[PDB]
Structure formats: C-alpha cells, structure tokens
Design a protein around this ligand. Structure first.
Ligand SMILES: Nc1nc2c(ncn2[C@@H]2O[C@H](COP(=O)(O)OP(=O)(O)OP(=O)(O)O)[C@@H](O)[C@H]2O)c(=O)[nH]1
Ligand SMILES: [Mg+2]
Lengths: 103, 87, 14, 368, 283, 14, 360, 46, 49
RNA sequence: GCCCAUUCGGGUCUUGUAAUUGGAAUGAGUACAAUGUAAAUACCUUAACGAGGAACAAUUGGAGGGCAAGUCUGGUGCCAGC
C-alpha cells in the first residue's frame, strides 16, 4: 500500500470535511496527509470527531491501513488509511487521556 | 508610582466585574424568559432574530407587475398560448 | 447587513 | 555608492540620481514618441535578450541556507549590524527606557529575567479564538467568564474566556462550562498571537491558596484571531395555552403586547412534546395573547417555545501578571473565581427551584 | 530482513523544518534544574559546576554559563521551586531540563506541572535525576521504586529517556563518579530544533543594572520609571539592531529596545582532541 | 509542605 | 505612536505597507498649499476600499482633509463590490489590492465597477498579464481578473471581478540571478463601441514595428459587442513579452482617444515595449514595486533579484525609503561580476512575515 | 420583509453546503478509489 | 460502543412540569404525545372505514 | 431464570439480589534476628505487625443498547436518518 512498509509517516495538510454538519460522519473524521517517503498526498481517517482535534497541521502523523470488515453504511469507500499516531504519540492513548500530546 | 496607578485602575475593573460576576444576571442571557421576567416591552427595542415557517405572501410591486406584464406582452405577441381544442 | 460585523469606519471630519 | 545614496535620507531622490550620474502614476516615464521612433527604428540592440522526498526538501532548505551564508559574506557593518543583526550567541547589552521602579527595587536574582521579541502580530490586541480543554488531571470543571491565567507566547495574563460550541457547525453558541473530557472552543480578549500556537491556563498562581490539587487547568491551541466575534446565547420564550381547539390554540404569556406579537408573526414555535407550530396573529383584547396553529391538538399541560438567539459579548479584561514587580514574587492575586467571591461575601449559589430534576414516574396510559 | 529495513528506514523520516541555529558560535544551551523545594538543585548545580570548571561555586544565584565541551557550552539556572510563574518561563525557554525527583518520596506535583507546561509549550530535552536514594536497609525496595520511577517517567517523556540515579550526598555535594557520567550524559544530547524558539529572538538575562541618574532620583524622588541595561546571550532568530524593537520581558511588561551594543564573548569556546583545563571557563 | 501526587496521576488509568 | 509621512505621494503604497506591517501611520500635508487642498475623491474611496477589505482598522480624516491617520487592522477579505469614482479606473483600485490579496481570512472575491482604462493607470490586461505572473511565481497559484463588461472613459460602466483564492502564508524567496530569455511576444488589442477595423490597424502597426526582431509576434484581437462594450467608445493595445522557461513577462499598454490614429498607437505601444525590454532586467519598470514588496515580506531569508541600471529612479528609491521608513529594512545592491552591462542584484532579507488571519 | 430575506438566504446557504459536501465526498471517492483499485489490481498479480 | 466513552453516553434526565403550572398535571413529552397521537389515528381510521 | 428455532412457537427447571450478615485463613508489604559470607548482597530458617470498597483499588479488546423542553439533515402532518 505504502510500498514495502507496513506503516508510513506523513504530514497533515488540512482537516478535510471540517464543515460537515454531522458529528462522527466519515466525511468529517477524514484527514489529508502528505506521505514523506514519496511525497504524494493521500487521505486518511481518524478514530472519531473527538480525536479530530488532536491533529491540526504539519503534525508528523503515522498512518496504517484501514481494513474494512464489511460494506459499511455511512462509508466513503476510497479512503484506505487510518491515522494511528500523531507527533510520535498514539492518539488512542491521547483519546483516553493516557498521554499528553507534546509539541 | 506609574505601576501603582496602573494597579489601582486594574483593581477598579477587577472589583466592578467581580461583582458583575457575583451580581444578578441580565434577563436576556437567561433562557426561559416568560412575560413576567422581563422589562415590559423590551422586545421592540431588542433587534432579535429567529426563524419562520413559510415565505410570506408577496407584496406586488411595480417591477414584478411589469415583469409578468412584458412577459405576457411577449407571449401574446408571438401567440404561443395554450387553450383547448374542439373534438 | 454591511454594518453587522464591522469594527472600523473612516472618520470624515470634513 | 548607490546604496549609501539611497539610504542617505537628507537629500532628494533626483539629487541621488544627479550625483550618481510619483507612484500614483502607474505606467512609467517614456520618451517622446518621435525620439523613441528614431531610437527604435533599429532593432539590433536587444536581439541577444530575444531568442527521496524528505531529503529533497532538506536539500532545498540547505541550498537556501548556503545562499544565506554566501550572500552574507559582505560588508562588516552591513552584515553584523543592519542587514540581519545579532544572530545567536552574541552577548549583548540591551537598554530599556521607562522600566518600572518596582523591578529595580525588588530585583531578586533567583527569579530569571527572560526577554523575547514580539512579532508584528503579537503587539495587537483583540479576540483570540482558541480550542481548549480542561486538563485531564485538573479536578474542577471550568466556567465561562471566570478568569484564568493563560501562558500564551511570552505573556502570562489573566483573562475572562467564554467557551463556545458550533452545534453541528451552524452557530458558534455559548456554553456555560467547559466539557468534562474533550475540547471546546473559547474566545478571550488578549494579545493576538499567531494561529496554531499552544498555551496552558491556570486557575491559581499564588502559594497561599495552592492547595493539594493539580494547578494547571486548561490546555489548548489557538485556532484564529479576530477583532470581533459573533457568539450567541439561546433564549427561549415560553408561553402557555389557555384556549385550545383542534389544530390551533390561543397562547397566553410569552409576549407583553400586540406590538411584540406583531414583531414576531409567522415564527415557528413548538411545544415540549415536539409538536411544531407557527404563530399567526395577535389577539385583540388580551394583549400578549395570540393565535397559533400546530401540527395537531396540543394539550392544556403543555408549554410552547420560541427558540431565539441572543448575542453575547466577551469581556475586554486583561491584566498581565507582573509577578516580578512584587515584593514576594509568588502570591500574585488577580480576579477571583465566582465560588471564591460567593464564599467571601456569603451569597448562596443561585438555585432555580424548578430547574432541579426529579424522579418522574409514568402513570399508565389508557384511552377511552 | 527487507521488511525490517523498510520499517526501520521509515522512522528516519520526519517533518522537514528549518533550523535557525548557527553553526559557528551557537549560544550556550540553557540547562534548567527543576525540582520541588527540598531536593538536589543547589547541591547539584554546585557539583556539576565544580566538576566542569574546577571551581567551588558556593552560594549560587542567577544563570551560570560554563564551558563543558570543545564546542558545547551551557547555561545553568535554577527555578525558584514555589513559583509557577518562573516555572512557566523557564519551561518556555529551556533547552535541557534536569528534572529533580525525590526518589524516596516519589513523584510530585511541581515536577508534574513543569512536565505538562513544557509538553504544551514545546517539550525540550529532559534528563530525569532521582536523588534521596537512602530508602532503608531494603535494597529490594530501592530496586522496586527505582523501576517504578523509571516507568512512570517513561510515560511522561519519550519511552527511553534517561533517568539518572544519584546516591547520598558526601561532603556537601554529590559523588563525583556519578556527576562525571552525568556530565557524560549531558555532553551528548543532540538537540532538535523547536518552533517558537526558532521563530522568536529571545534572551535569558545574566546581568542587570539600572543606568539611571542618581541625582535625577534625588530630584524626582524614587517614583521614576528608570532606564535599565540587560546583558546576556541571545538565542533563536536574529534580533534586529535598530532601536524600537518590541520586547516582552516575561514578568514585568512590554517595552521597546533603545540601544544595543554587542559585547565580546565573556565565556568563549576555544578553537581526538581534549578540552584544556585552562579553557574550562566559567561566567 | 510537600504537595504529594495522587492516584490518578500516579497510576494513570485514564 | 504614528510613523509620520509628508505629502500625497505614494499614498496607496503607504496605506498598503501600513496594512501589511500593522503599524499606525499619519500622512500629513495632503496638498495643503493648493487651491482645493486635501484628499481627493479617488483616494478617499481607496480608503473606503481598505475599510471594506480589513476589519478593525480605524481611519481618521481631519477637518481640512490634508492629513489622514491610519491605524491598521486584520485583513479579512470577504466578497464585496466597489463602485470606484470616474477620476480613476478600476486598475487604480485593483493594483493595491494585489498586495493585500493573498494574506486574508477569506479569499478575495471583489468586483470593481467603473472605467476600465486610463492613460496613467493600470488596465485589465496590464493587471492580468503583467502583474499576475509575478505573483504566480512569488507564490500564489490561483488568481484571476475577469472582465464581465468593460467601460472606456469618460462614462465607463464596466465591471471587473478580481478573485484570488490561494491564501498563502508568506511569499517565497525570489532567486533571479539571470536575465530571462524572451521566448515569445504576444498581446491583446481591444476595442469597445467602435468599428472592428481599428483593432486590425493597431495590430498591423505594432507588428510592422516588431517585424525586424527574429522572435515570434502574436497579438490577439477582441472587439466588445453588446452590453459588454460599456457606455463609451474606446480602443487600446497591450503587448507583453513572454519568457516561457521561467514565466517572466514585460508589458506595455496604452489607449487611444478623440483624434488618434490606430496604426500610430500600435507602433507607439510597440516601441514603448521595446524600450521596456531595453530598460528591463527580470522585471519591468512597473512590475518592480510589488516584486520587491513580496521580496521584503517573504520569509526571514535572503532573496535576490536582478535589476539593471536604468530601473533605478526617484520612484524606485522613494519606494525603498518608504519601505525602510515603515519596517526598517534595507536592500543590498551588489553588482554582477561581468561587465558588458550595468546590472545590480538586489538582495533583500525579508522580514519574518506570516499571514496570521487565516484560520488553522 | 425580514421573513422573506432570512428564509431565502438560509435556503441559499443550505443548497451551497450540500453541493460542497457532495463534491468533496465523490472527489475523495473517485480519485482515491481509483488508486485503491489499482493497488488491488497490482496486488492480485502477486 | 467502539470509540465512545461511557462518560459520553451518559443519561440525560427529563424535566418536570413547572410548579406554577401544576394543576394541569404531568407536562407530557414526546413519548406521551406519540401514545396520544397513534391512538387518535387508529380510532379515526376505523371511524373512516 | 435458562435453552432451541426463519416463522408461529417449543423445551426445561431452585433461580436470583451494588439484600443484609458472620467468624476463620493467610499472602504481598513492614520488619526482630540469626545463618550465609574476607566483608556485604542474595538464597535458606525466622519471632512482631499486616484485609474488607479485603481501597492492600489487574488490564486489554469486543457486542449491544437506552436517555434530553438538546442539536443537525431530508420531506407527501406526528416520520425517516445522522
Ligand atoms: N540525604 C540526602 N540529602 C540531600 C540530598 N541532596 C540534597 N540533600 C539535602 O538537601 C538539603 C536542602 O538543601 P538543597 O538540597 O540545596 O535544597 P534545594 O534542592 O536547592 O531546594 P531549595 O531548598 O528549594 O532551594 C541540603 O542541606 C542537603 O543536605 C541527597 O541526595 N541525599
Ligand atoms: Mg536552591
């Protein structure tokens, strides 16, 4: 997906769907990221709207594949990756407040 | 001193908005304002906005009456109107 | 609607 | 020669050009057309004018840096004073005029004297729009229009923030507390830093009230700066029915006059049952009473609701801490929290009696 | 091993930012010793400067800049432990933080508050230093609390930061073996450029005076907003040399500069090799 | 005067 | 508090650089020793345009009208419209908006309404083909001047939709240490409310002057028919010379008036263009102001741009004096190390500019 | 008068927003699901 | 609950009738109204039949 | 209460409860020692104290709800959706 690696590091451009009027919609929890290896711009999810305010811009994100287990309902098929870290800190730990995001 | 009179005017606005914070609300910030919990007709002087059901009835103006007027001028000039036909 | 979110204004004293 | 002539600013610009050898007019100065015709009848004067990604970004920025060095290698008072000036590691003396008396009087060398250079933005004041968060280890929730000391850039300053929400991105309407475990927006009158800068916020900075808990209260970043914000606080107008028919009702007291109802005609109301409705016309003799039409028959035990929005203002309050101008340099006291003011002047906290929840038990619902 | 090579070569990639720190004469790296009131600090700053410059610097005050390498020199200062304000300022300008932890008592809210203020204002390098290792006869509980402090420190800094263990104080200051390899840890730290610091010209003031006029004070009578010279090294971006540059002195207010005379370096680094004891200077 | 840490900062079960 | 200027020269550049720098200025003695002293209506409406574009900026005109106080504010942009007076065309108001244009909260979508052209101002084709490419390679990528209708003087009645929609942080640092090779030379000959043969007469005059240089000449032709023509007869011609390997351009325009021969105007604009090529090096004599303004509000690095000897003038150095008067920066003119010509390379270290109005 | 103006500006705002959101949804669908299917197509050869 | 907090899916409690308006007992809410309305609608449906 | 089953339904049986309550147990810990050993650590042996939220406070991941005078979207009332 990323070539030969399992994850890939990337640079957050801008939170896509920031004007979506529906909380936790797949358009809303959807981030555009420039991968640092080959320079190309891809689009990645994030776990929810609640963890959407941990990424802001040029954040040194780390992103893995998504792995849909079945045709979802409010999906947008055509986004492959999910954000799994931000600035070297796991944002699931950030979301449950186990760590604090350093800058 | 200079910092002394800066500090006392700071302390002045400290005092006035700390007893704004303790003191009684404005009615207009509080929700569930009834009739008996307001200044009587503070609402004409309010400039308050809200929403409405439907677009109200159109006030007929000179420009819209000349709009459908030269519309039917065009229509009955070229005679492209629609009636019934005999069987 | 033009006034609604302004904060400046020219001050014409002429 | 020419740079010294340009920046020697007691001589006229035409005198600079004269001893070397106006912008409302956009197009520049040309000759006469006849002189230009005899000049450009020939053409041969200007016939020779006529005819991995990460390492790539690092290479571009190091290319710019070596361009910086090899173009700095120039005149010594040009580089070392005026074209860049005092790079880093330069030991300087720096003189400030009109420093307060209290600094020199109470200068205790334990407390560090830090100085930082403000940008063009950070000397401007106005509303800063942040998104913030109650810090996960701070115990108590935060309240709007309670002061907290922010550490925003170089400055530490006590301000009055007001926490907002863009409820499904429609308004930016006003909360009364920060949320328990997530981010809200906020807006405070303070010095306008740039966007995307982070900050902390503290309830209490002194040591007499330092207690046992965690002292840093808020964290956040700055989203936007502006000179004005337009935020709202919902007000509903409640009125009750007193004469009900099928599909229409006469509503008693949300207005005081038929002028007020005339101002509000056609507005959509609803009962607490979610029955939508619309106000139609003010009744004549009872003054604030009007006629509304609903989706179906409302009951005598209902309350109608006109959801409106009232604008609310941030409070232009700003005092920087100035802890180094004190004789103690801890024990800085600013505006107090609202519970501290109530505890001081012994006012009981405001309790609406019909705002308190109860244990509702449904009766069984049987119809005829 | 090819998948290993890809997944390891991936984590060399980071966000490419500018540096804005010079390579010819960089400023002395600001080392801030941060502790709750009653542990290390003074004794620790004294021991480090005595090992570094062969000079018993009893009764410290203010920032202390010494030369500790052939090209790395660094500035020692100590926060007053009760002031959250000074805690906040040195969190915003420090480069290295020696985080004092009373290992017998455990973690504490002053060091936790510094860690969070630094984490939000641009987390510098942090070397944790745990003192008071005089727990009991129980070397078992010494090792247990040692491991627990290391893990709790690793959840606050990156997983693999350095927690250092100091033994008991012997003759006024710490054991010089422990301070020797502590300075060995400080000497290799490989600082990475921050953001606010590298778009802002700042300066920690190691010398202060008022160049006012005492007979003008005799005329007006001590109410005078008086002029002040502030001497020190400056970091970050190049501060411009024209008068009128606006400046926040963090704790007294906002001013604008009047005149800058740059001075020759009072603590300079000299031009495989080793550092001469002649050239181990102190300012 | 020792502001000891407490259980939620100590064990960090967020 | 206020940086003080004197006289009503460079008025738009002073208000523009005060808006960029965020510094309160006063401009004193606006033509005070004159029969009708004070500010004129076109610069008063320019102040109204500044109040439209920014937000929280307070402008304070005096009683006599001969001194103005500009305390600037945040550039916010938005969509607007500007009914500028007959004293100046739309180019007089869209030229100083191209500086403020990429540094706002919301993107510039303004439409100006008035006279299109003037002898002593910028035209639509001037603004577009000359001044948009230097911004296009200084960092913006989406900028467009649309003509919806155009109006020749004196009655005018033409509307111009300026839309910039790349809100950059700061312009990039320029590095033009060369003289760009001119690849082509194109243009546009326009005419409103007159016969369509005048455009071909203008094109034939310009190309018969241009025919002896061994490049390629191409002039496009537009007559304006209908309501898009405006309320007055007019015609004019604008040539550009195009360096295509980098994107540079050098332009020259004019317009005809009552009694003007179109072959005369075509050959005049052709010879004026060739003289701009002669007196030009990597910029034009009129593209040079915003070029060095974007170089001075770039990053905190060194940006260098080649200029020639004849581009130095009283206008250029009064620009440099106003730049140093507002935000205290100097240009360093170092000469090139080859001597068949006199070209300096102006290196400017840009101030540390970012746009802080765009929400993150 | 304020009724008619407020209603029609709210309708315009909603009809703009729906177009904008549908545009960004199916541009993310088309010009990234083409790459998803291209990666699946060149992963099926392995 | 895949990415939801239990402090987020809390229980919002419902409000009672105002004590001034208390003789008209039990301010009815949307579940009470739908119990009213679908009863009325089924009885009107059989009356129409 | 539990089990089966696409459906209607069928099969089965002492099963539950932030209900009260009772005295026993000891282990992590805190610690006398002696042994060990050049000496000290550790193992081994070992008196004293050490449990009720036995708070002396193990996690991680998954499945599903339910709620408001709340908010948003659609449109053939009271609905559908998020
Ligand atoms: N037992 C023991 N005592 C120590 C140790 N380190 C410091 N101390 C004692 O700590 C006492 C308090 O003085 P300092 O340590 O200088 O205090 P500080 O850490 O600078 O903190 P402040 O008092 O707030 O300035 C000293 O008299 C030392 O004896 C250590 O490792 N072990
Ligand atoms: Mg000390």
């Amino acid at each position: 997906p990323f070539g030969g690696s399992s994850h890939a590091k990337g640079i957050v451009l801008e939170k896509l769907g920031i004007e979506s009027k529906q909380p936790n919609s797949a358009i809303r929890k959807c981030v555009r990221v420039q991968l640092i290896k080959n320079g190309k711009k891809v689009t990645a999810f994030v776990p929810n709207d609640g963890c959407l305010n941990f990424v802001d811009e040029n954040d040194e994100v780390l992103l893995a594949g998504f792995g849909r287990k079945g045709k979802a309902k409010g999906d947008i098929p055509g986004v492959r990756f999910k954000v799994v870290k931000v600035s070297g800190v796991s944002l699931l730990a950030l979301w449950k407040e186990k760590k604090e995001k350093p800058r | 001193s200079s910092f002394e009179k800066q500090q006392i005017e700071i302390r002045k606005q400290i005092e006035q908005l700390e007893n704004e914070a303790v003191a009684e609300k404005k009615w207009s910030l509080k929700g569930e304002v009834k009739a008996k919990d307001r200044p009587e007709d503070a609402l004409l002087t309010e400039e308050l906005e809200f929403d409405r059901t439907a677009k109200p009835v159109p006030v007929i103006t000179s420009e819209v009456t000349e709009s459908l007027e030269d519309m039917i001028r065009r229509r009955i000039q070229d005679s492209n109107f629609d009636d019934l036909q005999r069987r | 609607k033009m006034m609604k979110n302004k904060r400046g204004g020219v001050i014409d004293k002429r | 020669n020419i740079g010294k002539l340009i920046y020697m600013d007691n001589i006229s610009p035409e005198e600079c050009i004269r001893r070397w050898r106006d912008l409302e007019k956009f197009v520049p100065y040309f000759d006469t057309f006849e002189k230009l015709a005899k000049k450009w009848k020939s053409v041969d004067a200007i016939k020779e004018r006529f005819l991995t990604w990460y390492e790539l970004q690092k290479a571009k920025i190091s290319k710019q840096l070596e361009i910086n060095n090899i173009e700095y290698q120039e005149m010594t008072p040009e580089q070392r004073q005026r074209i860049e000036g005092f790079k880093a590691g330069s030991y300087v003396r720096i003189v400030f005029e009109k420093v307060p008396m209290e600094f020199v009087k109470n200068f205790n060398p334990k407390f560090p004297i830090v100085m930082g250079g403000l940008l063009p933005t950070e000397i401007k004041f106005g509303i800063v729009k942040a998104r913030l968060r109650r810090h996960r280890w701070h115990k108590k929730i935060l309240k709007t229009n309670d002061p907290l000391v922010l550490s925003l850039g170089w400055r530490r300053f006590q301000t009055l923030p007001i926490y907002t929400t863009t409820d499904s991105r429609t308004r930016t309407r006003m909360l009364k507390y920060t949320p328990e475990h997530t981010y809200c927006n906020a807006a405070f009158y303070g010095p306008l830093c740039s966007p995307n800068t982070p900050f902390c916020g503290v309830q209490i900075v002194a040591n007499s009230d330092t207690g046992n808990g965690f002292r840093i209260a808020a964290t956040g970043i700055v989203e936007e700066i502006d000179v004005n914000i337009e935020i709202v606080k919902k007000l509903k107008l409640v009125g009750f029915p007193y004469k009900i028919f099928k599909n229409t009702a006469f509503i008693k007291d949300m207005f005081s006059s038929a002028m007020e109802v005339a101002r509000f005609e056609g507005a959509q109301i609803k009962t607490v049952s979610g029955i939508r409705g619309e106000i139609k016309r003010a009744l004549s003799k009872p003054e604030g009473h009007y006629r509304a039409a609903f989706e179906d028959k409302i009951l005598m035990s209902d309350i109608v609701i006109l959801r409106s929005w009232y604008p609310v203002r941030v409070k232009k309050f700003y005092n920087p801490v100035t802890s180094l101008l004190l004789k103690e340099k801890t024990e800085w006291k600013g505006l107090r929290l609202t519970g501290q003011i109530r505890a001081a002047m012994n006012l009981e906290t405001p309790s609406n009696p019909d705002s308190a929840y109860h244990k509702i038990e449904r009766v069984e619902r049987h119809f005829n | 091993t090819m998948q290993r090579s890809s997944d390891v070569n991936e984590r060399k990639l980071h966000v490419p930012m500018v540096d804005r720190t010079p390579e010819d004469d960089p400023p002395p790296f600001i080392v801030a010793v941060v502790g709750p009131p009653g542990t290390g600090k003074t004794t620790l700053i004294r021991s480090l400067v005595r090992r570094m410059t062969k000079s018993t610097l009893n009764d410290i005050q203010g920032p202390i800049t010494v030369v500790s390498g052939k090209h790395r020199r660094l500035t020692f200062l100590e926060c007053p432990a009760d002031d959250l304000n000074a805690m906040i300022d040195i969190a915003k300008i420090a480069d290295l933080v020696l985080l004092l932890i009373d290992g017998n008592f455990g973690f504490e809210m002053e060091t936790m508050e510094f860690l969070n203020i630094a984490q939000h204002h641009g987390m510098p390098r942090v070397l944790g230093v745990a003192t008071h290792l005089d727990l009991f006869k129980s070397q078992s509980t010494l090792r247990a609390s040692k491991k627990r402090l290391k893990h709790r420190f690793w959840t606050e800094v990156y997983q693999g930061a350095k927690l250092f263990y100091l033994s008991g104080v012997i003759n006024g200051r710490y054991p010089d073996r422990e301070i020797l390899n502590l300075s060995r840890f400080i000497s290799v730290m490989k600082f990475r450029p921050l953001k606010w610091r590298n778009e802002h010209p700042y300066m920690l003031a190691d010398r202060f005076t008022d160049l006012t006029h005492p007979e003008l004070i005799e005329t007006q009578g001590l109410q005078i907003d008086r002029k002040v010279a502030i001497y020190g090294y400056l970091h970050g971006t190049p501060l411009p040399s024209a008068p009128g540059t606006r400046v926040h002195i963090a704790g007294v207010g906002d001013f604008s500069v009047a005149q800058i005379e740059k001075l020759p370096d009072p603590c300079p680094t000299p031009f495989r090799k080793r550092l001469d004891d002649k050239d181990k200077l102190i300012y | 005067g020792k502001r000891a840490i407490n259980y939620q900062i100590l064990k960090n079960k967020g | 508090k206020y940086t003080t200027f004197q006289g009503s020269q460079n008025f738009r550049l002073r208000i523009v650089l005060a808006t960029l720098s965020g510094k309160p200025i006063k401009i004193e003695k606006i033509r005070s020793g004159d029969l009708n002293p004070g500010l004129k209506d076109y610069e008063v409406s320019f102040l109204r345009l500044i109040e439209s574009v920014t937000n929280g900026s307070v402008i304070e005109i005096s009683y006599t009208g001969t001194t103005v106080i500009y305390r600037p504010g945040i550039i916010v942009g938005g969509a607007s419209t500007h009914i500028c007076p007959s004293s100046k065309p739309v180019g007089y108001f869209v030229e100083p908006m191209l500086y403020l244009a990429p540094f706002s909260k919301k993107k510039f979508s303004i439409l100006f309404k008035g006279i299109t052209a003037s002898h002593n101002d910028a035209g639509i084709e001037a603004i577009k083909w000359g001044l948009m490419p230097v911004m296009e390679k200084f960092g913006v990528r989406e900028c467009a001047l649309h003509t919806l209708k155009r109006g020749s003087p004196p009655l005018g009645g033409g509307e111009v939709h300026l839309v910039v929609d790349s809100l950059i942080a700061q312009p990039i640092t320029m590095h033009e240490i060369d003289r760009p090779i001119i690849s082509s030379i194109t243009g546009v000959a326009y005419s409103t409310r007159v016969s369509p043969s005048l455009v071909n007469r203008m094109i034939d005059g310009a190309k018969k002057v241009l025919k002896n240089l061994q490049c390629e000449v191409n002039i496009t032709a537009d007559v304006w028919r209908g309501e898009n023509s405006g309320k007055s007869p007019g015609w004019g011609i604008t040539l550009v010379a195009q360096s295509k390997q980098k994107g540079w351009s050098y332009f020259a325009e004019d317009i005809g008036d009552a009694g003007s021969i179109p072959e005369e105007l075509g050959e005049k604009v052709a010879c004026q263009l060739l003289e701009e090529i002669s007196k030009s090096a990597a910029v034009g004599r009129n593209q040079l102001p915003l070029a060095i303004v974007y170089m001075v509000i770039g990053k905190e690095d060194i940006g260098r741009l080649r200029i020639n000897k004849e581009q130095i003038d009283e206008r250029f150095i009064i620009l440099l004096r106003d730049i140093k008067k507002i935000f205290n920066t100097e240009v360093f003119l170092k000469p090139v190390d080859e001597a068949d010509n006199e070209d300096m390379i102006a290196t400017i270290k840009g101030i540390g500019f970012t746009n802080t109005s765009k929400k993150i | 008068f304020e009724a008619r103006q407020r209603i029609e500006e709210k309708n315009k705002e909603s009809s703009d927003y729906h177009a904008k959101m549908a545009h960004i949804v199916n541009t993310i669908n088309t010009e990234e699901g083409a790459e998803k299917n291209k990666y699946e197509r060149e992963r099926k050869l392995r | 609950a895949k990415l939801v907090h239990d402090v987020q899916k809390k229980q919002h409690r419902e409000r009672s009738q105002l004590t001034s308006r208390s003789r008209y007992g039990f301010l009815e809410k949307h579940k009470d109204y739908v119990k009213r309305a679908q009863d009325f609608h089924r009885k009107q449906s059989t009356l129409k039949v």
